[PDB]
PDB file of all heavy atoms in Angstrom:
ATOM      1  N   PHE D  39      25.304  16.679 -27.963  1.00 75.34           N
ATOM      2  CA  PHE D  39      24.269  16.225 -27.048  1.00 75.34           C
ATOM      3  C   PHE D  39      24.521  14.756 -26.846  1.00 75.34           C
ATOM      4  O   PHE D  39      24.581  14.016 -27.877  1.00 75.34           O
ATOM      5  CB  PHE D  39      22.869  16.432 -27.686  1.00 75.34           C
ATOM      6  CG  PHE D  39      22.531  17.875 -27.836  1.00 75.34           C
ATOM      7  CD1 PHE D  39      23.014  18.602 -28.922  1.00 75.34           C
ATOM      8  CD2 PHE D  39      21.732  18.583 -26.862  1.00 75.34           C
ATOM      9  CE1 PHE D  39      22.746  19.977 -29.099  1.00 75.34           C
ATOM     10  CE2 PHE D  39      21.506  19.903 -27.009  1.00 75.34           C
ATOM     11  CZ  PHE D  39      21.970  20.619 -28.106  1.00 75.34           C
ATOM     12  N   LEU D  40      24.832  14.384 -25.638  1.00 77.19           N
ATOM     13  CA  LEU D  40      25.172  12.980 -25.253  1.00 77.19           C
ATOM     14  C   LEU D  40      24.294  12.545 -24.110  1.00 77.19           C
ATOM     15  O   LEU D  40      23.845  13.362 -23.284  1.00 77.19           O
ATOM     16  CB  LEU D  40      26.594  12.938 -24.898  1.00 77.19           C
ATOM     17  CG  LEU D  40      27.195  11.662 -24.334  1.00 77.19           C
ATOM     18  CD1 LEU D  40      27.150  10.513 -25.365  1.00 77.19           C
ATOM     19  CD2 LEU D  40      28.639  11.889 -23.915  1.00 77.19           C
ATOM     20  N   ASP D  41      24.158  11.182 -24.047  1.00 78.81           N
ATOM     21  CA  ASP D  41      23.339  10.672 -22.913  1.00 78.81           C
ATOM     22  C   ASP D  41      21.983  11.308 -22.876  1.00 78.81           C
ATOM     23  O   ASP D  41      21.374  11.533 -23.910  1.00 78.81           O
ATOM     24  CB  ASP D  41      24.074  10.838 -21.541  1.00 78.81           C
ATOM     25  CG  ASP D  41      25.391   9.982 -21.487  1.00 78.81           C
ATOM     26  OD1 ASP D  41      25.363   8.841 -22.004  1.00 78.81           O
ATOM     27  OD2 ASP D  41      26.316  10.456 -20.983  1.00 78.81           O
ATOM     28  N   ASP D  42      21.513  11.738 -21.721  1.00 79.45           N
ATOM     29  CA  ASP D  42      20.203  12.350 -21.562  1.00 79.45           C
ATOM     30  C   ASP D  42      20.106  13.673 -22.310  1.00 79.45           C
ATOM     31  O   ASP D  42      19.046  14.301 -22.518  1.00 79.45           O
ATOM     32  CB  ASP D  42      19.677  12.532 -20.208  1.00 79.45           C
ATOM     33  CG  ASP D  42      19.180  11.196 -19.586  1.00 79.45           C
ATOM     34  OD1 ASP D  42      18.847  10.320 -20.399  1.00 79.45           O
ATOM     35  OD2 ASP D  42      18.963  11.131 -18.338  1.00 79.45           O
ATOM     36  N   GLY D  43      21.314  14.166 -22.679  1.00 79.36           N
ATOM     37  CA  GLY D  43      21.271  15.484 -23.427  1.00 79.36           C
ATOM     38  C   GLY D  43      20.564  15.425 -24.773  1.00 79.36           C
ATOM     39  O   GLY D  43      20.116  16.388 -25.231  1.00 79.36           O
ATOM     40  N   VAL D  44      20.532  14.117 -25.298  1.00 78.17           N
ATOM     41  CA  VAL D  44      19.789  14.003 -26.615  1.00 78.17           C
ATOM     42  C   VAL D  44      18.341  14.370 -26.395  1.00 78.17           C
ATOM     43  O   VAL D  44      17.638  14.774 -27.378  1.00 78.17           O
ATOM     44  CB  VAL D  44      19.895  12.621 -27.187  1.00 78.17           C
ATOM     45  CG1 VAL D  44      21.426  12.341 -27.310  1.00 78.17           C
ATOM     46  CG2 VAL D  44      19.225  11.636 -26.338  1.00 78.17           C
ATOM     47  N   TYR D  45      17.822  14.310 -25.188  1.00 79.11           N
ATOM     48  CA  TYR D  45      16.399  14.588 -24.934  1.00 79.11           C
ATOM     49  C   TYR D  45      16.122  16.093 -25.028  1.00 79.11           C
ATOM     50  O   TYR D  45      15.018  16.539 -25.170  1.00 79.11           O
ATOM     51  CB  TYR D  45      16.072  14.180 -23.534  1.00 79.11           C
ATOM     52  CG  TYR D  45      15.682  12.614 -23.408  1.00 79.11           C
ATOM     53  CD1 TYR D  45      16.148  11.871 -22.333  1.00 79.11           C
ATOM     54  CD2 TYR D  45      14.866  11.988 -24.390  1.00 79.11           C
ATOM     55  CE1 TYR D  45      15.857  10.515 -22.300  1.00 79.11           C
ATOM     56  CE2 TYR D  45      14.503  10.704 -24.261  1.00 79.11           C
ATOM     57  CZ  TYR D  45      14.982   9.961 -23.232  1.00 79.11           C
ATOM     58  OH  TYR D  45      14.585   8.684 -23.078  1.00 79.11           O
ATOM     59  N   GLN D  46      17.191  16.898 -25.016  1.00 78.12           N
ATOM     60  CA  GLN D  46      17.066  18.304 -25.082  1.00 78.12           C
ATOM     61  C   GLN D  46      16.538  18.792 -26.469  1.00 78.12           C
ATOM     62  O   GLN D  46      15.951  19.756 -26.649  1.00 78.12           O
ATOM     63  CB  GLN D  46      18.421  19.061 -24.812  1.00 78.12           C
ATOM     64  CG  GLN D  46      18.865  18.952 -23.417  1.00 78.12           C
ATOM     65  CD  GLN D  46      20.089  19.814 -23.221  1.00 78.12           C
ATOM     66  OE1 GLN D  46      20.324  20.800 -23.916  1.00 78.12           O
ATOM     67  NE2 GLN D  46      20.933  19.441 -22.197  1.00 78.12           N
ATOM     68  N   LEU D  47      16.727  17.856 -27.476  1.00 75.67           N
ATOM     69  CA  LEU D  47      16.374  18.164 -28.814  1.00 75.67           C
ATOM     70  C   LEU D  47      15.111  17.524 -29.364  1.00 75.67           C
ATOM     71  O   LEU D  47      14.783  17.458 -30.562  1.00 75.67           O
ATOM     72  CB  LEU D  47      17.521  17.785 -29.818  1.00 75.67           C
ATOM     73  CG  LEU D  47      18.861  18.554 -29.630  1.00 75.67           C
ATOM     74  CD1 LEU D  47      19.864  18.100 -30.651  1.00 75.67           C
ATOM     75  CD2 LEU D  47      18.598  20.047 -29.867  1.00 75.67           C
ATOM     76  N   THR D  48      14.265  16.905 -28.432  1.00 77.66           N
ATOM     77  CA  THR D  48      13.036  16.324 -28.884  1.00 77.66           C
ATOM     78  C   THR D  48      12.053  17.327 -29.464  1.00 77.66           C
ATOM     79  O   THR D  48      11.962  18.519 -29.049  1.00 77.66           O
ATOM     80  CB  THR D  48      12.336  15.583 -27.681  1.00 77.66           C
ATOM     81  OG1 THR D  48      12.001  16.481 -26.680  1.00 77.66           O
ATOM     82  CG2 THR D  48      13.181  14.449 -27.169  1.00 77.66           C
ATOM     83  N   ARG D  49      11.292  16.915 -30.493  1.00 80.74           N
ATOM     84  CA  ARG D  49      10.302  17.789 -31.091  1.00 80.74           C
ATOM     85  C   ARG D  49       8.973  17.680 -30.408  1.00 80.74           C
ATOM     86  O   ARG D  49       8.695  16.660 -29.731  1.00 80.74           O
ATOM     87  CB  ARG D  49      10.229  17.369 -32.592  1.00 80.74           C
ATOM     88  CG  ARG D  49       9.567  16.020 -32.820  1.00 80.74           C
ATOM     89  CD  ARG D  49       9.883  15.493 -34.216  1.00 80.74           C
ATOM     90  NE  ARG D  49       9.429  16.397 -35.297  1.00 80.74           N
ATOM     91  CZ  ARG D  49      10.125  17.327 -35.815  1.00 80.74           C
ATOM     92  NH1 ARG D  49      11.392  17.534 -35.360  1.00 80.74           N
ATOM     93  NH2 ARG D  49       9.691  18.145 -36.759  1.00 80.74           N
ATOM     94  N   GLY D  50       8.145  18.752 -30.575  1.00 79.40           N
ATOM     95  CA  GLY D  50       6.822  18.731 -30.012  1.00 79.40           C
ATOM     96  C   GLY D  50       6.657  18.896 -28.477  1.00 79.40           C
ATOM     97  O   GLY D  50       5.725  18.505 -27.959  1.00 79.40           O
ATOM     98  N   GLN D  51       7.618  19.545 -27.849  1.00 80.16           N
ATOM     99  CA  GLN D  51       7.504  19.769 -26.403  1.00 80.16           C
ATOM    100  C   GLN D  51       6.394  20.753 -26.220  1.00 80.16           C
ATOM    101  O   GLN D  51       6.245  21.755 -26.785  1.00 80.16           O
ATOM    102  CB  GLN D  51       8.881  20.325 -25.928  1.00 80.16           C
ATOM    103  CG  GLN D  51      10.005  19.290 -25.844  1.00 80.16           C
ATOM    104  CD  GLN D  51      11.364  19.984 -25.455  1.00 80.16           C
ATOM    105  OE1 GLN D  51      11.339  21.065 -24.937  1.00 80.16           O
ATOM    106  NE2 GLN D  51      12.450  19.208 -25.650  1.00 80.16           N
ATOM    107  N   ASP D  52       5.593  20.464 -25.193  1.00 80.53           N
ATOM    108  CA  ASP D  52       4.404  21.308 -24.746  1.00 80.53           C
ATOM    109  C   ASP D  52       4.440  21.384 -23.221  1.00 80.53           C
ATOM    110  O   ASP D  52       4.129  20.443 -22.495  1.00 80.53           O
ATOM    111  CB  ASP D  52       3.120  20.626 -25.229  1.00 80.53           C
ATOM    112  CG  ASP D  52       1.941  21.477 -24.784  1.00 80.53           C
ATOM    113  OD1 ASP D  52       2.053  22.491 -24.060  1.00 80.53           O
ATOM    114  OD2 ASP D  52       0.785  21.097 -25.256  1.00 80.53           O
ATOM    115  N   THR D  53       4.819  22.544 -22.727  1.00 80.42           N
ATOM    116  CA  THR D  53       5.012  22.746 -21.318  1.00 80.42           C
ATOM    117  C   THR D  53       3.840  23.431 -20.589  1.00 80.42           C
ATOM    118  O   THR D  53       3.934  23.762 -19.357  1.00 80.42           O
ATOM    119  CB  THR D  53       6.253  23.578 -21.051  1.00 80.42           C
ATOM    120  OG1 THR D  53       6.004  24.926 -21.627  1.00 80.42           O
ATOM    121  CG2 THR D  53       7.417  22.940 -21.646  1.00 80.42           C
ATOM    122  N   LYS D  54       2.676  23.650 -21.186  1.00 81.74           N
ATOM    123  CA  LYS D  54       1.547  24.292 -20.479  1.00 81.74           C
ATOM    124  C   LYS D  54       1.111  23.537 -19.255  1.00 81.74           C
ATOM    125  O   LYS D  54       0.616  24.116 -18.219  1.00 81.74           O
ATOM    126  CB  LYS D  54       0.395  24.492 -21.443  1.00 81.74           C
ATOM    127  CG  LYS D  54       0.676  25.480 -22.570  1.00 81.74           C
ATOM    128  CD  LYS D  54      -0.515  25.734 -23.395  1.00 81.74           C
ATOM    129  CE  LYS D  54      -0.237  26.738 -24.534  1.00 81.74           C
ATOM    130  NZ  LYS D  54      -1.443  27.041 -25.343  1.00 81.74           N
ATOM    131  N   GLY D  55       1.272  22.209 -19.272  1.00 81.33           N
ATOM    132  CA  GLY D  55       0.848  21.410 -18.165  1.00 81.33           C
ATOM    133  C   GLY D  55       1.780  21.431 -16.936  1.00 81.33           C
ATOM    134  O   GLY D  55       1.310  21.125 -15.801  1.00 81.33           O
ATOM    135  N   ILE D  56       2.979  21.857 -17.070  1.00 79.50           N
ATOM    136  CA  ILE D  56       3.895  22.022 -15.921  1.00 79.50           C
ATOM    137  C   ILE D  56       4.191  23.446 -15.467  1.00 79.50           C
ATOM    138  O   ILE D  56       4.963  23.610 -14.507  1.00 79.50           O
ATOM    139  CB  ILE D  56       5.234  21.233 -16.184  1.00 79.50           C
ATOM    140  CG1 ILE D  56       5.977  21.957 -17.373  1.00 79.50           C
ATOM    141  CG2 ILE D  56       5.052  19.788 -16.375  1.00 79.50           C
ATOM    142  CD1 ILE D  56       7.396  21.445 -17.633  1.00 79.50           C
ATOM    143  N   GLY D  57       3.485  24.348 -16.051  1.00 80.56           N
ATOM    144  CA  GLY D  57       3.598  25.761 -15.610  1.00 80.56           C
ATOM    145  C   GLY D  57       4.905  26.395 -15.927  1.00 80.56           C
ATOM    146  O   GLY D  57       5.288  27.362 -15.280  1.00 80.56           O
ATOM    147  N   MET D  58       5.683  25.944 -16.944  1.00 82.83           N
ATOM    148  CA  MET D  58       6.949  26.540 -17.205  1.00 82.83           C
ATOM    149  C   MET D  58       7.066  26.914 -18.726  1.00 82.83           C
ATOM    150  O   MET D  58       6.261  26.441 -19.585  1.00 82.83           O
ATOM    151  CB  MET D  58       8.108  25.503 -17.137  1.00 82.83           C
ATOM    152  CG  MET D  58       8.464  25.036 -15.763  1.00 82.83           C
ATOM    153  SD  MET D  58       9.917  23.973 -15.843  1.00 82.83           S
ATOM    154  CE  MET D  58      11.220  25.130 -16.011  1.00 82.83           C
TER     155      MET D  58
END
Side-chain angles (χ1 to χ4, degrees):
Chain D
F39 296 82
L40 171 67
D41 294 321
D42 281 345
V44 304
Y45 278 137
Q46 291 185 29
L47 298 179
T48 60
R49 65 198 306 88
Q51 288 174 14
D52 178 354
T53 64
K54 294 185 178 181
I56 59 171
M58 288 185 83

